[PDB]
Design a protein around this nucleic acid. Structure first.
Ligand SMILES: Nc1ncnc2c1ncn2[C@H]1C[C@H](O)[C@@H](COP(=O)(O)OP(=O)(O)OP(=O)(O)O)O1
Ligand SMILES: [Mg+2]
Ligand SMILES: [Mg+2]
Length: 338
RNA sequence: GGCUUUUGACCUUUAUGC
RNA sequence: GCAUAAAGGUCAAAAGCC
């Protein structure tokens, strides 16, 4: 029980309940190998029109290394050559959702594996079960347009790519509805972080699931991850820190949701006039404001004022729980941010 | 400090797709 | 070169146990 776990033993809680088991990371690497192989080697050979898979991006928990044991998805982004514009991705993702299912079910007719389902939807979702899986791994398969292309790190994406995105997102009314194209940037924001930050994120995520079971409608889990990176960057910066403090710090950010204005300039900045103007309007929006580091149009925590109202009421309640109290019963401190 | 596990960086391969 | 999985090597971060 996270609620009754002493603050001192939070790292032990993460170690044997949250950190991936070797069995788990073996279960996942295999399940991915099956589908990556499937997508590349059979799914689109039989071409009424040449469909080429340029990439299959491992994203979400798996890509970042923020997986909860036995509870994390496998999120695979499929970059297709026929998808050439963002609107192409919007207009044609559904065709490809339906085709991939059709191929998977054909591969289920052959006894290669089993699969359980489940423009309009964003992803194909299913539980894959092979011989060496059985209990099955859950999947989200995301067809997407390669807006970034192949790229060497240590360099920002071309700002023109973001000019296109912003113009396209506002010509239409779907801001942040193309975050998928920038999954590699979403990933590399967390993937290279110090180890214990990912651990802390795992802890925050499990706490979040325990609120989802209780409250139902809630802000995206990604928002809470970004809050944790924010809490870490502003209140610590050490590879070695106090988990109970960081956990309390994130909870208080959630409480301070009516004041949050958070953004990073890792993949975009204000040098380009069109981006500069858009970003500045974004920081103006009602609180909280949590910009996706990979997508300036992606405002997390922008959807539900009620969702944060409830999440803050649970976080407030949690501050009295044994996990924020030391041996002597004194409260754990929270970091003072920047 | 010892043992182990998790998460990464870089380097070299193998299969596969582009 | 990029992407997935695997194999070898070099380095590192943290955690569990002692
Ligand atoms: N940018 C976003 N905006 C709104 N919702 C999002 C966004 N990104 C993800 N989600 C939601 C939709 C999905 O149904 C749900 C699952 O995301 P997911 O890919 O599984 O992230 P994750 O892998 O890091 O968390 P998990 O621990 O569940 O695996 O989160
Ligand atoms: Mg996932
Ligand atoms: Mg998912």
């Amino acid at each position: 029980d996270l609620r009754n776990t002493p603050a001192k033993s939070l790292d032990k809680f993460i170690e044997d309940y949250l950190l991936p088991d070797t069995c788990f990371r073996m279960q996942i690497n295999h399940a991915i190998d099956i589908i990556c192989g499937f997508l590349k080697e059979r799914c689109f050979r039989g071409s009424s029109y040449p469909v080429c898979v340029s990439k299959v991006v491992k994203g979400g928990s798996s890509g970042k290394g923020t997986t909860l044991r036995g509870r994390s998805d496998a999120d695979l982004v499929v970059f297709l050559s026929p998808l050439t514009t963002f609107q192409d991705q919007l207009n044609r993702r559904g065709e490809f959702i339906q085709e991939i299912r059709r191929q998977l079910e054909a591969c289920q007719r052959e006894r290669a594996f089993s699969v359980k389902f489940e423009g309009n939807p964003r992803a194909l979702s299913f539980v894959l079960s092979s011989l060496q899986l059985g209990e099955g791994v859950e999947f989200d398969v995301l067809p997407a347009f390669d807006a970034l292309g192949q790229l060497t790190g240590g360099y920002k994406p071309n700002p023109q790519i973001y000019v296109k995105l912003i113009e396209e997102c506002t010509d239409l009314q779907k801001e942040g509805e193309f975050s998928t194209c920038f999954t590699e940037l979403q990933r590399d924001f967390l993937k290279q972080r110090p180890t214990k930050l990912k651990s802390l994120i795992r802890l925050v995520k499990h706490w979040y699931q325990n609120c989802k079971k209780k409250l139902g409608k809630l802000p995206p889990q990604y928002a809470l991850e970004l809050l944790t990176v924010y809490a870490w960057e502003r209140g610590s910066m050490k590879t070695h820190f106090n988990t109970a403090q960081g956990f309390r710090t994130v909870l208080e950010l959630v409480i301070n949701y009516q004041q949050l204005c958070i953004y990073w300039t890792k993949y975009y900045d204000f040098k380009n006039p069109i981006i500069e103007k858009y970003l500045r309007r974004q920081l103006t929006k009602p609180r909280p404001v949590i910009l996706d580091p990979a997508d300036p149009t992606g405002n997390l925590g922008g959807g539900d004022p009620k969702g944060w109202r409830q999440l803050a009421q649970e976080a407030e309640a949690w501050l009295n729980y044994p996990c924020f109290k030391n041996w002597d019963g004194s409260p754990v401190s929270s970091w003072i941010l920047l």
